[PDB]
Amino acid sequence: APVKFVKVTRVLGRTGSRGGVTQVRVEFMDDTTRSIIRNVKGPVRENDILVLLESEREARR
Amino acid sequence: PFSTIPSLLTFLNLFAQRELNVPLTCRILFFVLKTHHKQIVASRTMRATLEKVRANL
């Protein structure tokens, strides 16, 4: 059960998000090329480090 | 998402050979480059698809 350091590259425009949660674009800290979009609740800005568990799955709306 | 990117890129290849709505296709191509460039230069399988769509365009 490893842990993944990641960072927000870009917050996303018009997801139509239910509630204050936000779909965001992250790029890895280790495999910095591998960049996906995932789901984040709460206040968030661009360009900042995060910590996750499940990297393989792509987060939906 | 980047899982959808190769499907989109292949469709850009289809429109490139079957030329329709040229500025639309070019603009969306450039945009997906600038939002995914490092993934693009890091990947391997896309290189062939990019070569083909490049010839077509």
Partner: peptide
């Protein structure tokens, strides 16, 4: 709904291809 709209539209187009 527009992004996922054109997304699964692309997906069905891939199936047809």
């Amino acid at each position: 709904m527009a992004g996922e709209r054109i997304a699964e539209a692309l997906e069905l187009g891939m199936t047809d291809l």
